[PDB]
Ligand binder design. Structure first.
Ligand SMILES: [Mg+2]
Ligand SMILES: [Mg+2]
Lengths: 106, 106
């Protein structure tokens, strides 16, 4: 059904989701083909004030958002295929324009 | 990170989620280890009247809901591990007591 670029090779998927941010963020753990574990996350359109504890690596699969680190003077745009590291102990805003599907590894 | 009983063997995860039901439902397509093709769905607490043109197999992964077939005299609880064929062409309800993770195929 799905074209190769529309899917991510995997080994396993987690049964249980976790919902946060007033119902607007959900994720499940997954094991990718390389054996590594990520949180496969969906973030609905909206404006989110967040912070990290440990550093986060985010690989965006689909959607569009603006990332703004508290102390930065411009945003970073996130589109399909983008990646970026949220440093440890970072306050930031995500403004999601199109539902954001991403792998978060921490 | 995940014990065996927390996960389901896979081959691929769809990149792009589909959101519906006023933000209450999200699906991505997945391919399981046996090559079969399902909608991996999260349905947030609520009560929803659903239907399909074709029979679909539901396999509940996590959470709790009551299923009520169109016109039926009582409901049926579907817990983690429960699978059934949902007939086509009938307006069933799912009352989601705890966020429901499920596969839906066929
Ligand atoms: Mg603390
Ligand atoms: Mg079983």
């Amino acid at each position: 059904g799905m074209a190769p670029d529309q899917q991510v090779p995997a080994t396993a998927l987690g049964k249980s989701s976790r919902i946060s941010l007033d119902g607007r963020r959900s994720e499940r753990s997954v094991i990718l083909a390389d054996g590594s574990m990520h949180s496969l996350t969906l973030l609905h359109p909206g404006v989110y004030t967040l912070s990290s504890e440990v550093a986060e690596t985010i690989r965006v699969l689909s959607g569009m958002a603006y990332y703004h680190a508290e102390g930065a003077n411009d945003v970073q745009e996130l589109h399909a295929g983008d990646s970026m590291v949220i440093p440890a102990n970072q306050s930031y805003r995500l403004e999601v324009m199109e539902p954001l599907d991403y792998l978060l590894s921490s």
